[PDB]
Amino acid sequence: DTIKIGAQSMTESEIVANMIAQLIEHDTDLNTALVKNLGSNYVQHQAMLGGDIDISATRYSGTDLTSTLGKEAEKDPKKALNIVQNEFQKRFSYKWFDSYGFDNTYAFTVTKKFAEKEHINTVSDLKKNASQYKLGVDNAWLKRKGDGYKGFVSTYGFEFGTTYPMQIGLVYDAVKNGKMDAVLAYSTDGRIKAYDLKILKDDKRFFPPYDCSPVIPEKVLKEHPELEGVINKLIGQIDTETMQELNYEVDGKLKEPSVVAKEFLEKHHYFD
């Protein structure tokens, strides 16, 4: 009776995974374990297949759509969501829930200085001097299909001078400190606001939506009928603006994801 909760290696996945674990134990007698440092959605998916985790705390619609399901990058939020839901159900009997209420999308990000200096408002504005720029990206974007670099190139019609892959958590100082001209940040990271960075408009709508949801096998839900009510408490409850604050509590204020989770659940009375 130990529910195994997967967290991807993002602050966000850790906060949400602890929130799920605590809400489970508060409402139930099921205990819980966290399985951290899953490198990606593929790692998260494989582990669910093998039964190493019972719950993905965080999955993102555009990410599994273009990799796990091998589909085209659907550009509409609603349609892209319905497609992963019906496909996860049809293919695996896994329930991809409705969103928590937030989108966590790749976002081209620069300092306000650099954008005045280079006159940048949109991702197409980068084209003009692109080969002069250094771009910071995560370990996994350059090789991704459909929504990765290969696809960025054939949509936007240019490449950056040099691309630097690094742990996502480092792209926020690297851009503030002039070490990169641009980075491919994640929009729910709270350091974008905290460092007064600028998100460039994705003017060609290259990126799919990345609405965030928990995923749990039906097999696991039927086995523990009191689980879905728990998870249901969180659905539609965390907007982007809230998830940016929560993330910042860990990345900026250096609090444990467990403490951030506890404090959020306490503020909302554990949603009863």
Rounded Rg: 19 Å
With strands numbered from the N-terminus, the spatial order across the biggest sheet is 2-1-3-10-4
Named CATH architecture of the largest domain: 3-Layer(aba) Sandwich
Q: Per DSSP, what share of the residues sits in E-state strands of 2 or more residues?
A: 15-25%
The secondary-structure element order is: EHEHEHHEEHEHEHEHEEHHHH
PDB class: transport protein
Keywords: alpha-beta-alpha sandwich, osmoprotectant, transport protein
Assembly: monomeric
Entry title: Structures of the substrate-binding protein provide insights into the multiple compatible solutes binding specificities of Bacillus subtilis ABC transporter OpuC
Description:
The protein has 272 residues and is α/β, with parallel strands linked by helices. It folds into two domains: 167 residues, 3-Layer(aba) Sandwich (D-Maltodextrin-Binding Protein, domain 2); 105 residues, 3-Layer(aba) Sandwich (D-Maltodextrin-Binding Protein, domain 2). Helix content is 39%, strand content 19%. The chain is built from twelve helices and ten strands. It has a five-stranded mixed β-sheet with strand order 2-1-3-10-4. Strands 7-6-8-5-9 form a five-stranded mixed β-sheet. Helix 6 links the parallel strand 6 and strand 7. Helix 1 crosses helix 12. It starts with a strand and ends in a 5-residue tail after the last helix. It is classed as transport protein. Keywords: alpha-beta-alpha sandwich, osmoprotectant, transport protein.
